[PDB]
Amino acid sequence: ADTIVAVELDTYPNTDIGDPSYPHIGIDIKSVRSKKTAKWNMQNGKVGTAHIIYNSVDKRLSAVVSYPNADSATVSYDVDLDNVLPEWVRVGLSASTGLYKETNTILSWSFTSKLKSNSTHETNALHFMFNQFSKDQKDLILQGDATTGTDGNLELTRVSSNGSPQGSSVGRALFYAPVHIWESSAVVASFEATFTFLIKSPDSHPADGIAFFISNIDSSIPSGSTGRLLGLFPDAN
Amino acid sequence: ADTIVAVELDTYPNTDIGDPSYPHIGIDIKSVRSKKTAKWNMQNGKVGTAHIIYNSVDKRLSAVVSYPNADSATVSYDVDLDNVLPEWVRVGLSASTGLYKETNTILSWSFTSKLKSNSTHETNALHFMFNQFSKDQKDLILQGDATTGTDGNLELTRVSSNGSPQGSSVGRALFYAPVHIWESSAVVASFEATFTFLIKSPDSHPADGIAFFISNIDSSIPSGSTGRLLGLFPDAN
Ligand SMILES: O=C(NCCO[C@H]1O[C@H](CO)[C@@H](O)[C@H](O)[C@@H]1O)c1ccc(-c2cc(-c3ccc(C(=O)NCCO[C@H]4O[C@H](CO)[C@@H](O)[C@H](O)[C@@H]4O)cc3)cc(-c3ccc(C(=O)NCCO[C@H]4O[C@H](CO)[C@@H](O)[C@H](O)[C@@H]4O)cc3)c2)cc1
Ligand SMILES: [Ca+2]
Ligand SMILES: [Ca+2]
Ligand SMILES: [Mn+2]
Ligand SMILES: [Mn+2]
């Protein structure tokens, strides 16, 4: 299977696979069963912001999710991503729906990776910023149901023309270029990701969520990963 | 055939296809016969810097090549790149040798592209920076004789184990991700590229040069484009 590290915005509690009994943000290392979670006071139909940060000095992956004029949710986990990920990865967003559904709409996405060396004292860097997605976005790999260019947005899961989200949907968008995420001859390796999202459930019973993830370059949507597995994992182990 | 826009650092005077008598920097729009040139006091075996700039406000492509403690060479040409290039491109470096030869060593390369909309009043951007090239650089496409890893450098043309450049060589390195170089909904499109290079000829007779180029995404080395064609053009038209 793929190797996945992900930050989940999990809108539906699957208590049979370790979810707490409330919408939560979580850090996922090679399993949908989050190594750490925090309660998330998710706001139906309002624009949210997710910030993800990692640096190789602290070896700590953290995420903050916020809405205007509300308290943040934050979650952190100590992990050395050198022991978890391959040296080269792709970065992406994933979302899914099941019996229950929501818009998984991305309004903007930015990413920065840096390797600062000293032996050869100069830095390698990648930065991308999408504030507008177009109909034929050739620096994105769209998988499953993901589409671009509807009001300049990335729709990770299927939405009908009148704006109704579909059930049993899964879709992902990966940046085209592979990312050099760690190198054992750097003194500082770091990345940050920001996205703004609009999650709207008409039934106000939302599912299943959005994740930022980092994978092996050749990662694809695993068979049967709709619903609780967020288009990231083949099973619930 | 490919669509090419390029800034050439042309070390060899091919006076039959309109080169001047001396090493020159040139702006190439769909032909090796530069639309504009400037004299370049090229220094055998010293590290140089090239800076390339364009914005859609001035519609002016400019370049400056410099060494420590020396007068720059600069060249500009008015051109509307949205009348020349496709919307989506790749960016790269190219070099060649012919009967005469030189090391075509790249020590660093950075690129920034930005599209500023009025729709969102918000911006799409790509930035990469390589200060070190690794043996397996998965965010580069290498074509022809180009290799990475030797002392952390990119060698666009063939060099022997002791640093002797081979003749009749051609090689290119393209950034993996397509770039969105223009869009008619943007109010400003701009790019900049910077690279440092070490061009060394033991015979003290250098050829043929190095170019920064922008092409169609599926561009490859034209057949027979060693020597004066700099790996960019199928002919001297
Ligand atoms: O326009 C000029 N102007 C003057 C000189 O240029 C300078 O001058 C000033 C000071 O010097 C300075 O102020 C300026 O900077 C200025 O630019 C000019 C025009 C042409 C040439 C030139 C011509 C030729 C050439 C050779 C042979 C023919 C030929 O015989 N054609 C066939 C016959 O055609 C005619 O007759 C038939 C039959 O009747 C008819 O059908 C036809 O229609 C015709 O009428 C034509 C022209 C050649 C050169 C030249 C060639 C080669 C080199 C050179 O250095 N080669 C090295 C080897 O190349 C390989 O290695 C290189 C290095 O690695 C690579 O780059 C290559 O790719 C190869 O691999 C140099 C010059 C010039 C000159 C000036
Ligand atoms: Ca869940
Ligand atoms: Ca030439
Ligand atoms: Mn969960
Ligand atoms: Mn020239």
Swiss-Prot record, chains A, B:
Binding site for Ca(2+): 10, 12, 14, 19, 208
One Pfam short name: Lectin_legB
GO biological process: defense response; regulation of defense response to virus
Database matches in InterPro entries: ConA-like_dom_sf, L-lectin, Lectin_LegA_CS, Lectin_legB_Mn/Ca_BS, Legume_lectin_dom, Leguminous_Lectin
This protein's record includes keyword Cell division: no
Binding locations of Mn(2+): 8, 10, 19, 24
Binding site for a carbohydrate: 99-100, 208, 228
UniProt entry keywords in alphabetical sequence: Antiviral protein, Calcium, Glycoprotein, Lectin, Manganese, Mannose-binding, Metal-binding, Plant defense, Signal
Post-translational note: The mature chain consists of residues 164-281 followed by 30-148. To form a mature chain the precursor undergoes further post-translational modification after removal of the signal sequence; cleavage after Asn at positions 148, 163, and 281 is followed by transposition and ligation (By formation of a new peptide bond) of residues 164-281 and 30-148. This maturation (circular permutation) relies on the legumain AEP1 activity and leads to an increased stability of conA after heat stress and at various pH.
GO molecular function term, any single one: metal ion binding
UniProt keyword Glycoprotein, yes or no: yes
Function: D-mannose specific lectin. Displays antiviral activity and therefore may contribute to defense against infections.
Miscellaneous comment: Binds one manganese (or another transition metal) ion and one calcium ion. The metal ions are essential for the saccharide-binding and cell-agglutinating activities. Displays strong antiviral activity against herpes simplex virus type 1 (MIC=0.32 ug/ml) and the rubella virus (MIC=7.2 ug/ml).
Subunit and interaction comment: Homotetramer.
Similarity section: Belongs to the leguminous lectin family.
Full protein name: Concanavalin-A
Natural source organism: Canavalia ensiformis (Jack bean)
